[PDB]
Prior knowledge:
EC number (chains A, B): 2.4.1.20
Pfam family, one (chains A, B): Glyco_hydro_94
Structural class of chain A: alpha+beta
Keywords (chains A, B): Glycosyltransferase, Transferase
Radius of gyration of chain A: 28 Å
Shape of chain A: globular
GO molecular function (chains A, B): carbohydrate binding; cellobiose phosphorylase activity
Strand order of the largest sheet of chain A: 1-2-9-10-11-12-19-16-15-14
Protein name (chains A, B): Cellobiose phosphorylase
Oligomer: homodimer
Amino acid sequence: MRYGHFDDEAREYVITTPHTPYPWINYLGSEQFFSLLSHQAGGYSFYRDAKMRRLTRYRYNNIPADAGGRYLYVNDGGDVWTPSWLPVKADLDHFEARHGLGYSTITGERNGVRVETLFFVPVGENAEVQKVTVTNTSDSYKSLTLFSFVEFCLWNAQDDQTNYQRNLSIGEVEVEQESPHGSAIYHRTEYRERRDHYAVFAVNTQAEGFDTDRDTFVGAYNSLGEAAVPLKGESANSVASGWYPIGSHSVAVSLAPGESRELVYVLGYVENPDEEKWADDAKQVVNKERAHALLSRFATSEQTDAAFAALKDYWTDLLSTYSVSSNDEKLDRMVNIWNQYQCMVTFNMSRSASFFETGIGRGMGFRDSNQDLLGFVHLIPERARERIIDIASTQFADGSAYHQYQPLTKRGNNDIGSGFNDDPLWLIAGTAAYIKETGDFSILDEPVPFDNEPGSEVPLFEHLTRSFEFTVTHRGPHGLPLIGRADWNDCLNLNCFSTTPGESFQTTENQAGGVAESTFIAAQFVLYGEQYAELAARRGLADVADRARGHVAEMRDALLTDGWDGSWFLRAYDYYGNPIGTDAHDEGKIWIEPQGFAVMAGVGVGEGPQDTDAPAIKALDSVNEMLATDHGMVLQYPAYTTYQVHMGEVSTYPPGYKENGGIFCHNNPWVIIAETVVGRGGRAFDYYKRITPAYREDISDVHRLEPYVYAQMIAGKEAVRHGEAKNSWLTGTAAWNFVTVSQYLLGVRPEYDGLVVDPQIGPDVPSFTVTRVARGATYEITVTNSGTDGSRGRLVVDGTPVEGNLVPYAPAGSTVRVDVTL
Amino acid sequence: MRYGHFDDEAREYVITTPHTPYPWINYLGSEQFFSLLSHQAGGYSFYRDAKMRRLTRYRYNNIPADAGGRYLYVNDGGDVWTPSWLPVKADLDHFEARHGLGYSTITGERNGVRVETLFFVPVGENAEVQKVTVTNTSDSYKSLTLFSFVEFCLWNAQDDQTNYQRNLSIGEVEVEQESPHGSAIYHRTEYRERRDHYAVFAVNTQAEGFDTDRDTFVGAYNSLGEAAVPLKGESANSVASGWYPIGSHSVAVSLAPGESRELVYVLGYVENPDEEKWADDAKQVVNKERAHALLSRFATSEQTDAAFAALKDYWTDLLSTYSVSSNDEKLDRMVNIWNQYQCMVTFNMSRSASFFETGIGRGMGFRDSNQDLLGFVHLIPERARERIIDIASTQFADGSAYHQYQPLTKRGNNDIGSGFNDDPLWLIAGTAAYIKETGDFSILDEPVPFDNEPGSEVPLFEHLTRSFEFTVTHRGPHGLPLIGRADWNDCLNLNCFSTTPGESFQTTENQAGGVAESTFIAAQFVLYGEQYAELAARRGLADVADRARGHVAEMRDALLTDGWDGSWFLRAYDYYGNPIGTDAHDEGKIWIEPQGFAVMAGVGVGEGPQDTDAPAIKALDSVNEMLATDHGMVLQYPAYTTYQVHMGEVSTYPPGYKENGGIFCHNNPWVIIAETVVGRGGRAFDYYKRITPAYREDISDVHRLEPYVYAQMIAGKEAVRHGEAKNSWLTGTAAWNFVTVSQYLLGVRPEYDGLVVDPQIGPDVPSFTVTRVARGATYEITVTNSGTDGSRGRLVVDGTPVEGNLVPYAPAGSTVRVDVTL
């Protein structure tokens, strides 16, 4: 079952009913001001910091879900309805919502009145704009009144929801019914004290009335769906004093048959320098100059239309670096549009706010910053370089990393600390990705401090050295890296030993020392230590590179012996040196992470897909038998049915959810890539479709969440809810899946010395063309594909056959045509 | 306008409409299990810790307010309604809610069917019980289905509202439709891991069906007022797997005209020792022995009735220590019932959870702990003694105190720390009050550590010494105490200098040192410094005592000179030595706290109420002229109209709210006590009626909150909302007003050597009798009162006239009749 369809031409998802399985959202804003917006106009906006600068209030776990947002109550002769369906839930003759790139439109019609609203954050503005079009679709005259509505938040959302002892007495507003281009309301809570900012909520016409007090607009004992003011048919003109400020205007709208009217509403964020705060000598009236200027740039449909077209041009030009054309329009839409959009949004939003993440936490993982980079470095390489320098500057001098990074402050979280021993190597991963994409080896000479300490600067390359050496000097009894608090898997806490509720599994370590080791870090060391070695050699450090290849070699031996269970890689050794991820046990026999990543690193790979005695093939075959499902590969199997106190968070989930038997879409890509590595393209693409949004659209009633973006986790086979997704949008899944399909399935991936063209996608995509822009040139790669396991691409560059899979980088400006046959 | 009335005989407030100006609540539970219950059945319950063991979920700032609780959906031939009115809001023929002591009843009737629900937490049980009586009041036969409903919380309420990325996957239940006395649901989230507790939700009859999944019961896109399952008329028998667990049973109820039916529902909290968690060797089934036992003690109406009757005995026996009988039945009910109820509830609940405090924070002020004591010590002296020892044990060796005490752990909060220089003297206040009430001087010899350090114990009395000496060695340039981060006034922060939003005004000190001084601590030192000297002398430390009297003398002089502005006391000297609270300024001319406290201490008191040249009378006359209003006395005047960066939080509130011009009901008692001290009874009683719930009941439409308990703050004269209250129930206002009416207006107060009888209440209460139980005897005090300013009571004891106002304590068991004339 579907609840809409894609519109590829318009680069939108078109939702054709209000009755989706869950609220489906979009993100607006591409610089500093962001909005979450559901297909029912739910959500909120904030400037930079969703915790400390939220303009508007939103309730998570509302009954029903998502029943606050930007509403427009229509009163047509005493019948009240909203085009967003919620909150009033009147029967509409028509409904559609379209989520596009940085905008959405929502349209509702009832009793001969159509209302369409376009919501977007314009480039260069800290504001959410709504262009509303009202149309009389009947054969008689209409007299309407439209009441806009938005509920303010008192800026700090944490305080807003908890400190009512103070904050029910601080709500303040100013009202401006005769504003230079219409009518406006200013929310200025705490402007009298330390805030240099306020919010403005305005419309570009004379409002017949206004309301700034929720309780007055909505009425006692009422829900938003039963708001009294709209039902009365006129604003109460209320002025807030404490309690709950809102922004609402009534606008009178008369229409002949077939007539329409346009209106432009603006919700804006405004900051004044300290010495320009006040309009008046007595300091009681906010200085609205900047607010009037913003409102003057959106006083007409014409100006609003142009901003929308500049928006569209931003995204069209943004997503013009990698594209594909094929027989598979599901593949194409994901690759060309929705996967790249999703990766940009993860850049912008980090892990801040979604309909699952509540916007109070402002950090993200160090490892997430680097990994997210892999997916967007082709779109915004200068922002990427900056990011890398930013996070490397927080790194400790011993090479250890802050586990949590705070993008807003460019600092590591001191409360959480360090100790997650996979963190340091991800910096090599990011840096190398950046350099391969851009060729900017100069980043390695950039002076970068440790723990942001002035005077401590060394070249970025040296930070790479400290990351590498950290692993070498932190190994256990079998030569595998010590795991510390956890590795990529935040729930594998082998030094925790917690029996007290409330204690954090990640940072509590009730016993010290121990010999706990991770095979994931081992694979990560083999993969990224080989990248560091390459950078070192290229840098001219011959010895450094050679010792590095030495430790890497040692680590691949360690993995194939002490890291190997017989038919798959162990997951770890625990605090007392007993194995985890062994068929010797009833539960947790096989874990996916090491299988994927170790093979990605080339460990155990033999002569080809038919070399079944190769450890890589045994492992991937074991993954197929034991972990694969119709909805993806689960994390481990069997799942644990009782608490394993020696293992931390992992067994606290019911079987089949999150880290205890969940499908993490973030780590499936590691096995998809591994499958292309050993030569089984068909299998790899199979696995990719099972977790990818365009292919899961036909089972929307099962996925539940948005059919146009990846989610973090799909319920596993041991769950009653097998197939249902949670934690949509903000996830590393986007990046890793883009890397997988663009670089390994389609096979186009930048190297230091050239573009590698190495497709492995199997028989389902017989013909396709990739257009890639790299180091200033365009590469048109046309591929004819038999899909045979083990068949690799032979290249013809500009008419002449070449050996190998590497296409040397052409001068900027040029166009290189590559033909590939396999 | 009123929304109900007191039923004095029943010791209940009777709310006769659902349409109150705000949700009005009661508290259930007297030992370790507590419930908040509104007059619409809203609220929640928890065991000990409202942050970390909350059984059920409640949404603050819901639209509408308070729309989740313990509901019973009635389906009468397809019509669905709830007796609590909300959430369905169907028209009822009758509605009533009665809030009594530790119990409430709610009754609703619609179309020939009446439902009465008694809610209470039984003594000796960790459970909320509901006795439901359903009655057919029509002339026709009824066949109904009743659906119970409650929404579970995932125990840690902070996590519950924030960490959805984990917690939408962990909800677990078990269902037992064939329970030994009916049907039961178990909420067992995280029992598989670290939790040794679960919740049970049960009814004492065979349920037709059940539901444990919210979204199934309620339905997509619906509010609780619109729940699908009740409207369908049959349970869905949903079994939760993640998302939102609930407890619901359907029960069939057929009734002939006039016929009734009784049902008992239990919501219980259960812990099992770790050895006994599981019923099965595979560790998948909770051990239900303890829940079956609880359910067996409430399997019948008769059992329920006994338990209810034992609760009543609990409260009847406990409120038997102070009582009054007068012409004034508003006075009587506050003194006899509501003020004392409120005081016990603050002991029980601290400052944790109300409809304004959200139950996430679990501390209270060190100062609040001592002050609250003053109000409950006569009821529960054995618990009082314990509390004093617990809080004293956190005190630092240099005499400083933790500003925030955590009652659940008996520790100070280490994050907030110390530095509020009024804190240490409140320990003397608490300890003296305890000793005056009980005569237990032995508490002074108890060994008590500092900062809960082993080995550090010294006698309690020595803690009093360190508190005293702390002020002596922390005075400023004028001899007055250094204020530190703040004093009683949390918002007077003279060492903050904050210009950054989000920084705490109480703990941030952007400047070090300075010379900021407080006249409030000065007064506090004269009052409790003398209380310490008295204890020192009685203990035989004549030199110690005399030295203390000397420092106290110096301080009195310093208040009367450097602390004196001309017609009133200053409030403070700021960081640079400039005065605060002087007529020389345009705003903040006079502040109430020093005026009350200093006169309470006898500073400036003259020869009588006619001695209008005495500084106490000038100060109090200033208070009357500049601070008093129809609703109480505001904190200061005029309020600040712009931000005073040198003063902290005070001027951030708009004029007339909280600490900027608000009425603090907590500090009004100080001026009320001071008026009795100087001899102006009518004036003191005037002020007391202005802020007291029984007297404000007739303006409930202005007060807004509960007409039966004190609230922290009533909006001041400079507020548009002058008269409206916020922050009801959990406040020191209760204790201080109980002290005021019981010990100074009515005039009966314990001393070390006897009971003082010194009424000072004015002409409005011409005659009255106080019955007081003290040191094991009953004092029967009959008063004839002219109410003349300056007239003090002359006493006859058991028929014989005596001098002075002190009645020496009789041996226990005896009864003493004291006649008083003034």
